[PDB]
Symmetry: C3
Subunit: 174 residues, 3 copies
C-alpha cells in the first residue's frame, strides 16, 4: 500500500512536470509564430528593396549615358563655336551673312550693297598705271601732246572701270 502512495506521489510529480513542459511548448510556439510572421514581412521588405535597387542601378546606367552624351555635346560645341572673347583669329568653313553692317575695331567698314549704278562698259585696265606721268603742253598745238592726253584719259577711264568692276564683283555696288 505505501509502496503505492510512493507511486501516487511520483504520478503527481510527473503530471506537474508534463504540464510544465506543455506550457513551455505553447509559449515557444507562439513566440515562433510571431517570429515567423516577422520573417515573412522582412522577406517582403527585402524583396521590395532588391527590386528597388535593381531599378535604381538601371536608372543610374541611364544617368551615366545621359551625362556622357551631354558632356560629349558640350565638348563638341566648345571646340566648334565662335567665341566673342577669344583673341586669336577664328575661321568659318561657311559663308557668312549679317544684318546691316560689318565693323572693324568698333567702326563700320562694310554696309549693304549700294544700288542705282549703271554698269560701266569697256575693257578694264589692270596693268601698269603711272599716276605721276606729267603731260607736256606747249605754247603751240602738237598733235602728239594732246594725243598723250587722250591716251592718258582713256587709261584713267579704263582704270576706273577696273575699280568699279572689282566692287561690283565683290558685291559692294550693283
Amino acid at each position: 500500500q505505501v509502496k503505492n502512495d510512493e507511486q501516487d506521489v511520483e504520478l503527481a510529480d510527473h503530471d506537474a512536470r508534463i504540464a510544465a513542459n506543455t506550457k513551455a511548448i505553447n509559449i515557444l510556439e507562439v513566440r515562433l509564430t510571431t517570429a515567423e510572421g516577422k520573417i515573412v514581412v522582412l522577406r517582403s521588405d527585402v524583396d521590395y528593396l532588391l527590386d528597388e535597387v535593381i531599378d535604381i542601378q538601371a536608372h543610374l546606367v541611364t544617368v551615366d549615358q545621359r551625362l556622357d552624351g551631354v558632356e560629349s555635346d558640350v565638348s563638341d560645341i566648345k571646340s566648334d563655336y565662335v567665341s566673342k572673347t577669344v583673341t586669336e583669329s577664328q575661321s568659318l568653313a561657311s559663308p557668312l551673312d549679317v544684318k546691316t553692317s560689318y565693323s572693324v575695331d568698333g567702326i563700320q567698314v562694310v554696309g549693304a550693297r549700294q544700288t542705282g549704278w549703271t554698269a560701266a562698259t569697256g575693257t578694264p585696265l589692270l596693268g601698269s598705271f603711272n599716276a605721276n606721268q606729267s603731260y607736256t603742253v606747249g605754247t603751240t598745238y602738237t598733235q602728239s601732246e594732246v594725243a598723250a592726253l587722250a591716251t592718258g584719259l582713256e587709261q584713267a577711264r579704263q582704270r576706273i572701270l577696273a575699280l568699279e568692276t572689282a566692287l561690283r564683283l565683290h558685291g559692294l555696288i550693283d
Copy 2:
C-alpha cells in the same frame, strides 16, 4: 505481484522521457532566443535600407530634372550658335564687329577704316560710262575734239567721285 514491477518500470520510463523533453525544450529556447535576436538586428538593418532607398530615389528625381535642364539648354545652344565647321552659309540677325580684319579663304579682304581723306565734291556719275570711248586727236586743233576730252575728263572725275562716295558710305575710308 508483477503488479508494481510493471508500473515502476513505466514510471521510470516516463521520468526519463519527461526529462528528455525538458532538455530538448530548453535547447529550443536557446535557438529561438538567438533567432529572435537576429530578427531584431535584421529589422534594424532593413529599416535603415528602406530610408536610404527613399533618400536615393528622391535624389534621382532631382538628377533627372537637372539632366532635363542641361539637355534642353544644350539643345537651344546647338540650334543658335555659329559653327566653325559647318559648310552651309550662316546668317546673323545682328550686325557684326571684329578685331583688325575680315578674311575670305584665309586671305585678308577688309581691314580697318583708312583715314586721312578729304571728301571730294561734285555730282556723282552713276549713269552710263563708256571706258572704251576713243578720243580722236587730229593733226590740227579742233575745238570739238578737245571739247570731247574735257567732257570725258569731267565724266571720269565724276565717276571717280561716285566710287569714292561708295567707299566712304561703306566705311572703307573716312
Copy 3:
C-alpha cells in the same frame, strides 16, 4: 487493487501526453530550422543591399559633381557664344575668316581677293578733289586751257591711285 487500475488510467494518460509533447517538440524543431534557414538567406540579401547603397550613394555624389561640371560649362558657353538670333550688334575680340563670301541683308557685299592687278605708281591724292570742275575749250588753241586739262587728268589719275591703294591695303584686290 481498487486503486491500481486508477494508476493504469493515469499512466496511459501520461504516456499519451508525453508522446504528444515529444512530437510537438519535433514539429517545433522543424519550424525553427526552417526559420533559421530563412534568416541566413535574409542576412545574405541584406548584406548585399548594405554594400549596394554604399556604392549607389558614392555614385550619386559623382553624378552631382558631373552635373555641376556641365551646368558650369553650359553657363560659360551661353555668355561667350555668337548667336544667330540676337538682333543687337555682336563684337568679336578676334579677327575673322570665312569661306567664299560676306553678305549683308542676304546679299553678298564681299568676296575673295581679286588678283591680277599691277599696283599703280605715283603720289596718291587724298586732298581736295572737285569733280564738277568745268574745263573751258575755245575756238583756237590756248595753252592754259589744255594745261588745265592736263592738270585735271593728272589729278584724276592720282585720285584713282589713292582709291586703288585703299582697296589694296584692305585686301579687296592684290
